[PDB]
Each structure stands twice: as structure tokens, then as C-alpha cells.
Amino acid sequence: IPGYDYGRVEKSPITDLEFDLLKKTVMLGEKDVMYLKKAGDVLKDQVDEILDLLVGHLIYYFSNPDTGEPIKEYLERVRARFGAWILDTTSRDYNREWLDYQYEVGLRHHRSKKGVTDGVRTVPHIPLRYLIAQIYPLTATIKPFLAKKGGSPEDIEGMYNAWFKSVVLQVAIWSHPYTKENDW
Amino acid sequence: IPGYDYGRVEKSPITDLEFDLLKKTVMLGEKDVMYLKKAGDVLKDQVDEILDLLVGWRASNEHLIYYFSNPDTGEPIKEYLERVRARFGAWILDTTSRDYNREWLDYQYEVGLRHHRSKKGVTDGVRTVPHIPLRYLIAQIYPLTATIKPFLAKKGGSPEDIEGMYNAWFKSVVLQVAIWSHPYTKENDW
Amino acid sequence: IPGYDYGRVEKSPITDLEFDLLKKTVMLGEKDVMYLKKAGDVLKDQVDEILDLLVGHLIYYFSNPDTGEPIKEYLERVRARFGAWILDTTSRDYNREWLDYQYEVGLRHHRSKKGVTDGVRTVPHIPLRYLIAQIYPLTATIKPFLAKKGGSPEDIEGMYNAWFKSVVLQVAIWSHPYTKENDW
Amino acid sequence: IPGYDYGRVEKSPITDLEFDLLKKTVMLGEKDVMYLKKAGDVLKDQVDEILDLLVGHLIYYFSNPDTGEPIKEYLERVRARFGAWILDTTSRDYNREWLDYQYEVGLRHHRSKKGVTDGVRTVPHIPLRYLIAQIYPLTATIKPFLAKKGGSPEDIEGMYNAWFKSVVLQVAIWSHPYTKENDW
Ligand code: HEM
Ligand code: HEM
Ligand code: HEM
Ligand code: HEM
Numbered sequence: 001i002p003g004y005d006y007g008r009v010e011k012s013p014i015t016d017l018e019f020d021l022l023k024k025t026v027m028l029g030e031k032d033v034m035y036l037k038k039a040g041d042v043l044k045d046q047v048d049e050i051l052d053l054l055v056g057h058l059i060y061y062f063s064n065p066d067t068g069e070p071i072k073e074y075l076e077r078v079r080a081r082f083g084a085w086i087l088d089t090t091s092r093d094y095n096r097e098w099l100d101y102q103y104e105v106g107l108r109h110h111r112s113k114k115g116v117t118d119g120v121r122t123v124p125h126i127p128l129r130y131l132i133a134q135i136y137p138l139t140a141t142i143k144p145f146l147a148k149k150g151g152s153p154e155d156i157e158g159m160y161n162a163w164f165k166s167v168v169l170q171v172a173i174w175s176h177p178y179t180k181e182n183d184w
Numbered sequence: 185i186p187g188y189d190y191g192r193v194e195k196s197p198i199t200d201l202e203f204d205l206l207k208k209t210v211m212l213g214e215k216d217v218m219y220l221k222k223a224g225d226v227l228k229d230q231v232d233e234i235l236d237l238l239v240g241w242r243a244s245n246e247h248l249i250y251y252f253s254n255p256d257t258g259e260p261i262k263e264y265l266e267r268v269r270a271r272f273g274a275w276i277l278d279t280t281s282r283d284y285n286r287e288w289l290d291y292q293y294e295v296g297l298r299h300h301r302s303k304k305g306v307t308d309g310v311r312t313v314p315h316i317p318l319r320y321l322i323a324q325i326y327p328l329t330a331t332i333k334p335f336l337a338k339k340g341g342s343p344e345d346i347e348g349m350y351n352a353w354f355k356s357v358v359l360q361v362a363i364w365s366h367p368y369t370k371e372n373d374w
Numbered sequence: 375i376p377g378y379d380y381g382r383v384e385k386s387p388i389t390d391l392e393f394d395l396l397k398k399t400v401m402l403g404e405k406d407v408m409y410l411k412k413a414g415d416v417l418k419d420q421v422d423e424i425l426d427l428l429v430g431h432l433i434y435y436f437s438n439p440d441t442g443e444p445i446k447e448y449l450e451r452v453r454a455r456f457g458a459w460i461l462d463t464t465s466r467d468y469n470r471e472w473l474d475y476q477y478e479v480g481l482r483h484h485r486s487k488k489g490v491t492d493g494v495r496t497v498p499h500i501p502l503r504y505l506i507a508q509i510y511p512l513t514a515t516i517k518p519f520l521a522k523k524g525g526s527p528e529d530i531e532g533m534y535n536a537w538f539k540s541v542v543l544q545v546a547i548w549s550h551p552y553t554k555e556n557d558w
Numbered sequence: 559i560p561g562y563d564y565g566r567v568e569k570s571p572i573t574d575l576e577f578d579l580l581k582k583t584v585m586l587g588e589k590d591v592m593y594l595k596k597a598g599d600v601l602k603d604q605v606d607e608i609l610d611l612l613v614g615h616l617i618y619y620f621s622n623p624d625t626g627e628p629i630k631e632y633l634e635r636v637r638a639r640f641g642a643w644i645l646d647t648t649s650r651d652y653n654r655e656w657l658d659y660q661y662e663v664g665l666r667h668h669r670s671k672k673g674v675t676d677g678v679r680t681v682p683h684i685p686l687r688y689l690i691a692q693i694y695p696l697t698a699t700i701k702p703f704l705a706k707k708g709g710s711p712e713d714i715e716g717m718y719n720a721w722f723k724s725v726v727l728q729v730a731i732w733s734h735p736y737t738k739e740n741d742w
Contacts, residue, residue: 136209
């Protein structure tokens with residue numbers, strides 16, 4: 001998967017303790033790690049059906065800004081990495097390697113690295129306000145996929161809440177290159 | 185409620201269209217507005233029980249008390265916790281029952297400045313931790329969303345009712361934090 | 375100097391803009407900052423003489439209230455901090471650090487923290503009316519010391535007026551814990 | 559100066575006595591404190607010239623590790639703090655405040671906080687061996703600047719040796735987060 005750089009990016013300037021504190025704040029515990037891995041099982045085999053809901057109004061950020069035309073090759077390549085992110089979110093251990101890639105992913109929404117990974121000339125920057133807003137649809141979208149394979153509501157809620165915790169935590173990490181020095 | 189300034193704050197530097205776009209991004213529709221108002225009914229009469237989970241000076245609040253504290257001594261400011269708790273109590277019902285209009289937007293922006301070094305501590309005249317880091321505001325989206333759901337369900341009803349109320353609350357919390365981030369983010373990055 | 379906490383106190387609940395507006399109102403400009411620093415030169419070597427005029431209708435507030443007896447220790451320790459305040463007033467940059475200490479000093483006249491710094495059992499509270507009244511003697515007392523080393527009357531007036539501006543500004547800050555919520 | 563945190567950092571886990579013993583071992587006495595302050599006079603007005611020799615052999619540690627490309631903003635911001643360190647080394651009183659900042663500076667070479675201050679993704683860790691080796695060039699580089707303004711060789715040697723003592727003492731402090739528990 002071109003540009004997919006999990007495990008191959010530089011050290012994010014967030015410390016291990018600050019990360020641990022962040023996981024504590026979103027209440028990401030051992031239970032959620034289990035629920036996440038279980039979401040990975042439930043979602044593994046529905047990724048394309050998830051991808052069709054999300055990536056294949058914010059089309060604009062996949063576009064050439066001067067013409068407003070979307071970049072097919074940008075959408076395809078990001079979609080593929082997003083497909084991997086679905087399973088990275090569920091199945092990776094949320095360790096320094098994970099933190100570093102989440103930070104990378106945040107830089108790629110940011111003017112710092114947006115468009116660079118796919119070599120496209122695109123909207124340079126995704127405003128923070130939309131990254132945070134997106135927490136809702138990207139959280140809520142997953143839940144029908146978590147439930148389709150049945151099980152217990154407490155299973156579905158545990159998986160769902162763990163996913164929710166991860167999305168928030170990710171966006172919390174991503175905000176670091178968006179926020180003023182000292183305000184993060 | 186001292187410091188509670190809903191309807192009495194200055195114009196936030198966010199336009200009406202950017203706000204509307206933000207509500208559209210979190211998918212805050214007329215269904216959610218209805219669900220929010222219905223959460224207001226379900227929650228109004230459980231606020232103190234909600235407040236005890238989140239904010240008091242005899243609450244249950246966790247790794248967060250520090251931001252209610254004197255930084256040099258680490259001691260929490262009882263009067264800060266009580267006054268904020270009262271405003272938080274009103275915020276619960278403001279979140280459910282207010283119309284999400286310019287007046288609302290302006291107060292959400294105010295509330296974000298009050299977590300920010302710009303106005304934290306000023307409202308209660310306390311000498312406190314000057315600034316709540318953005319990372320924690322965003323992280324808090326989860327516990328402040330998830331905490332509400334048992335209270336939405338206690339009075340029974342339909343799961344689709346509870347989910348509608350719950351999701352609307354979720355949308356509001358995200359939208360609020362999205363607004364609050366504006367004084368935290370670099371010029372042009374919001 | 376025990377209790378002398380310049381640079382080591384918490385954030386006063388006064389904003390940077392409200393402080394700047396306050397300096398604007400007392401007309402504290404770049405000229406006064408220069409004149410203040412020059413007062414610092416003129417006064418540093420007369421502090422003890424200054425202190426003997428001021429601290430070594432006030433005495434009651436240095437006293438045990440039940441017996442009316444003054445607390446030697448309290449007077450000695452405050453005098454020392456006052457000695458430092460003379461030079462802090464002239465030589466510090468009037469920035470957030472300064473503002474925070476002025477606010478601290480106001481709390482120490484207030485029932486909020488009077489007596490705490492020196493661990494004394496004393497008159498709990500200095501009434502605001504006397505803090506404001508004291509603006510005059512604490513301003514006017516300094517002027518002979520500003521003039522003793524000679525120079526130009528315009529020098530002496532510039533130093534004197536800057537000192538006057540600072541004393542007012544300080545008391546203006548101190549009033550915040552004395553005034554009703556919303557009335558400051 | 560962004561990130562420049564002298565006087566604003568937490569308590570280093572080195573005691574006052576262990577610090578005093580360290581100054582005793584490098585033979586940092588009252589004479590050196592005087593010589594240091596005199597170096598401060600001699601160097602204050604040559605800092606940029608000094609900075610151009612050192613920071614604007616080990617560029618890699620200012621770099622992105624994956625690409626080896628140096629981070630201009632990292633070099634700029636560190637250079638500015640280094641400029642302040644030159645004058646902090648000469649002019650500060652070597653007290654607890656100073657010790658705490660030296661410890662901070664050592665953590666910033668260490669994997670514990672390297673890159674965090676400037677939010678850069680960089681080489682995570684400066685190996686201890688290079689911190690110690692650097693004692694020589696960072697000591698010897700200063701001496702022509704100490705001599706340029708003339709004076710006595712005994713003046714230049716006193717300033718030079720005091721600088722030498724400080725650099726060693728600093729690195730001695732910095733080694734604490736690098737060394738095994740109990741071996742420092
Ligand atoms: C309104 C908000 C958002 C918009 C408009 C947006 C759009 C984009 C775009 C254009 C890219 C590719 C950026 C580049 O490298 O040039 C991208 C990458 C990605 N986004 Fe977003 N995004 C948003 C928020 C989010 C959120 C909250 C998540 C949650 C994780 C997310 C997940 C991803 C993933 C997984 C990728 C691919 C990352 C990779 O390269 O591995 N996005 N998104
Ligand atoms: C989604 C996240 C959050 C929500 C929904 C929320 C809600 C609120 C509300 C409603 C208020 C009072 C507003 C008013 O004065 O009218 C408030 C104030 C406050 N909250 Fe938060 N809060 C959040 C995050 C946080 C975090 C992470 C902390 C860290 C402990 C925190 C600590 C405080 C403090 C110290 C105040 C007093 C602020 C001040 O000095 O004015 N809050 N919060
Ligand atoms: C009638 C008016 C005043 C009375 C009775 C008074 C008395 C006192 C007392 C009892 C203290 C010790 C407070 C404590 O317990 O810490 C004190 C501290 C002090 N006062 Fe006043 N004061 C008055 C007005 C002023 C004014 C106008 C100034 C001008 C700046 C001033 C300057 C100071 C200073 C510098 C200190 C030491 C602050 C520190 O702790 O560093 N006072 N005064
Ligand atoms: C081979 C050895 C060294 C290398 C490769 C190196 C490189 C660096 C780097 C990359 C930084 C930025 C660190 C950060 O991310 O915060 C830095 C900061 C700094 N270095 Fe070194 N350094 C070395 C040894 C030394 C020595 C012996 C000194 C003597 C004091 C010194 C003085 C400084 C100073 C003063 C700063 C800025 C401290 C501050 O943030 O205030 N370095 N150096």
C-alpha cells in the first residue's frame with residue numbers, strides 16, 4: 001500500500017507519559033484493547049463495505065483547489081490506507097509505534113504533509129475544526145458494522161466505545177501540529 | 185449562577201456559515217435538535233446525580249482535579265469547583281434545550297476561552313492552573329459523551345430514543361470542542 | 375527574604391489586556407519605565423532610610439488584635455519584603471510576572487492571605503479604604519529620596535510621577551479581591 | 559525564545575549537596591564565579607560569531623532520521639537557546655535554579671525529551687559518548703573569543719578554565735538520565 005508507513009515513521013514529539021496520560025483521559029483500558037481486537041475480527045471482512053461509506057461535501061479536501069476537481073488517484077490511494085487504518089485501529093497495540101503513526105496521520109491532514117504522500121497538488125490543509133467534527137461520523141459510522149455479525153449488545157457497546165475512544169485519542173494526537181506552541 | 189453568561193457574551197470570531205458547516209459535519213440535524221430537547225426532559229431531573237460523576241468538590245472526578253487546583257500547591261480550590269459545577273449543571277441543560285444559534289455558538293466559544301489560558305480562572309477570580317491543554321479537551325469528548333448515556337436510559341423508553349438522544353449529545357459535545365479549539369489552534373489552521 | 379515570592383506566585387485572575395488597559399489608564403508609558411529604572415538607581419542605596427520612615431496610623435495592622443500588641447517578627451519580615459518592593463517597583467519590568475506579584479501583595483493585605491506569609495496571628499484584614507488612602511503617603515514619602523541625589527527637576531518629576539503611577543496601578547490591582555464580583 | 563525555560567523547569571532529582579559536591583570536584587570556586595561573570599562581559603557581544611562556529615560536525619542529530627535531512631527550524635530554535643546558554647553559563651548564579659535548567663538541558667539531549675521542545679520529529683537520542691566527547695570542542699572553541707578583547711593571559715586562563723569547569727559540570731549533570739540506576 002503506497003504511502004502506508006505504519007511502523008516506518010519518525011519519532012513523534014509526544015512523550016510516552018503524555019501518551020499514557022492521553023489514553024487514561026479517554027479511558028482506554030485493557031478492556032478496550034480487548035474490545036478493539038474483537039472489533040478487528042468483526043470488521044476485517046467488512047472493510048470494503050465500510051470504505052464505500054467513507055472514501056472511494058468534504059470531497060473538496062481530495063480535490064485540486066483551483067479547479068475543485070477531485071483527484072481520483074488521491075482518493076484511491078488514501079482509501080487503501082484508510083482500509084488499513086480500520087484494521088490498525090482495531091488490531092495494533094497502542095504503543096509508541098502506534099502513536100508515531102497516528103502523529104504521522106495527523107501531519108498528513110495538516111498543511112505540514114497533506115498531499116505529499118501521494119504527490120498530488122491538493123487542498124493544502126484540513127482545518128482542525130473539521131478533524132474534530134469528523135470524530136462523530138467516523139465513530140458513529142462503524143457501529144452498524146460492529147453489530148451486523150450479531151452477538152451481545154454489551155459486546156457491541158464495548159467494541160463501539162473502544163473505537164470511539166481510539167478515534168478521539170487519535171484526533172487528540174493529531175491536534176498537536178495544529179495547536180499553538182504550549183497550548184496542546 | 186455567578187459567571188454563567190449564556191446570552192451575555194461578545195461575538196465569537198466564527199461566522200454563521202462556518203458554524204452551519206460545523207453542524208453539518210457533525211451531522212447535527214433537526215432530528216438531533218428534537219433528540220437534544222428530549223434529552224433535556226430526561227436529564228433535567230437527574231442533574232445533581234450527573235454532576236456528582238463529573239464535578240463537585242466531593243465528586244468522583246479523576247485525573248483532572250489538577251486543573252481546579254492552585255498549581256503551586258496542587259491544592260484544589262473548593263470555590264472554583266463549586267462555581268464551575270453550578271455552571272456545568274446549567275451547561276447540561278443548555279446543551280439539551282438551547283437552540284444552537286448564534287447566541288449558543290457565542291457561549292460555546294466563551295466556554296472554550298474559559299478552558300484556554302485566555303480566560304481560565306478569570307470568571308471565578310481564582311489563581312489556578314492557567315491553561316487546559318487542547319489534547320485533554322479533545323480526549324474529554326469521550327468521557328463527557330459516554331457518561332451521559334446511563335442517565336439517558338434510566339427513565340426507560342425505546343433504544344432508538346436513547347440512541348437518538350445519545351448521538352445528539354455526542355454530536356453536541358464534539359461540535360462544542362470543535363468550536364473551543366479555535367483559540368488553541370494556530371492562525372489559519374482551524 | 376522569607377515570604378518574598380516575586381516570580382514564584384500563581385496566575386492572577388486579571389488578563390494581560392486588562393493589565394495593559396490599566397497601565398494605559400494610569401498613563402504608564404515607556405518614559406515612565408525609564409524613569410522607574412532611574413528611580414531604582416537613585417533609591418537602591420537609600421532603602422534603609424526609606425524603610426525607617428515606613429516600616430520597622432498603621433501599627434495596629436501589624437499587631438495582635440486581641441492585645442493590640444505589635445508583632446516584632448511580623449514588622450521585621452514585612453519590612454524586608456517592603457525593602458525589596460521598593461526596588462521591584464523601580465526595576466522590574468511590569469509584565470505578567472510583575473502583575474502576579476502585585477496581585478499576591480494585594481491578597482496579603484486582604485483577609486485572603488494577610489498574616490499567612492509570616493505565620494502570625496494578626497489583624498485579619500486591611501480595609502480597602504486604607505489601601506487606597508495609603509496611595510498618598512506611599513507616593514509622597516518617596517519624593518525627597520528621589521531628589522536627595524540632585525539632578526534636574528524634570529528628572530525628579532519623571533521619577534516621582536512614575537512611582538506615583540506604579541503605586542496607583544498596584545492599588546488598582548489589589549482592589550480586585552476587595553471588590554464585589556463584577557464591580558472591579 | 560521559544561522553549562527557553564531557564565527558571566521555569568521542575569526540580570531535578572539531584573540534591574543540593576550532591577550539586578555542591580560536584581562543583582567542588584570540578585573545583586568551581588568563588589574565583590571561577592567571578593571569572594565566569596567576566597567571561598559574560600567578554601562574550602555577550604560576540605555571541606553570533608560564537609553561534610556561527612557551533613550551530614545555525616554533528617548535524618545528523620538536528621535531522622530527520624529517516625531522510626537525514628536537517629530541520630532548519632530545529633537548528634534555528636536550538637541556536638537561539640544555545641545563544642542564551644552562552645550567557646547563562648557565564649552570568650547565572652550556579653544555584654538550584656541553574657542546576658534544574660542544566661538537568662533540563664541534559665534531558666533535551668536524551669531520548670527523554672529530545673525534539674519535544676521544538677515539536678520536531680528528529681533523531682530521538684544523543685548518545686552519552688558524544689555529550690562527553692563534546693566537552694572538548696565546546697570548551698576549546700570559546701577560548702579565542704575570550705582572548706579577542708585582550709587583557710591578561712591570567713584573565714583569559716581564569717575565564718577559560720571557569721568555562722571549562724562549567725561545561726564539565728554541566729555534562730556531569732546531564733549524564734544522570736543516561737546512566738544506570740545507582741551508577742551516577
Ligand atoms: C473533516 C475531516 C477530514 C477530512 C476532510 C479528511 C480527509 C483526508 C485526506 C484528504 C486524507 C489524505 C491526506 C494526505 O495524506 O494528503 C486523509 C487521510 C486519512 N484520514 Fe482523513 N480526513 C478527515 C478526518 C479524519 C478523521 C477524524 C480520521 C480518523 C482516523 C481520518 C482518517 C484518515 C486516514 C486513516 C487517512 C489515511 C492516513 C494514512 O495515510 O495512513 N480522517 N483524510
Ligand atoms: C468535551 C469536554 C468538556 C466539556 C463538555 C466541559 C464542560 C465545561 C463547562 C460547561 C464548564 C463551565 C462553562 C461556563 O463557565 O459557563 C467548564 C469549565 C471548566 N472545566 Fe471543562 N469541559 C470539558 C473539558 C474539560 C477538561 C479536559 C478539563 C480538565 C480538567 C476541564 C476542566 C474545567 C475547568 C477548570 C473549568 C473552569 C474553567 C474556568 O476557569 O472558567 N474541562 N467545563
Ligand atoms: C493603610 C494601608 C496599609 C496597611 C495597614 C498596610 C499594612 C501591611 C501589612 C500588615 C502587611 C503584611 C501583610 C501580610 O501579612 O503579608 C503589608 C505588606 C506589604 N505592604 Fe502594606 N499596607 C498598607 C498599604 C500599602 C500600600 C499602598 C503599599 C504600596 C505598595 C504597601 C506595600 C506593602 C508591601 C510591599 C508589602 C510586602 C509585600 C510582600 O509580602 O512582598 N502597603 N502591609
Ligand atoms: C555530540 C554532542 C552533542 C550533540 C550532537 C548536541 C546536539 C544538540 C541538539 C540536537 C539539541 C536540541 C535538543 C532538543 O531537541 O531539545 C541541543 C541543544 C542544546 N545543546 Fe547540545 N549537543 C551536544 C552536546 C552539547 C554540549 C556538551 C553542550 C554544552 C552545554 C551543549 C549545549 C546545548 C544547548 C545549550 C542546547 C539548548 C538547551 C536549551 O534548550 O536551552 N550540547 N544540542
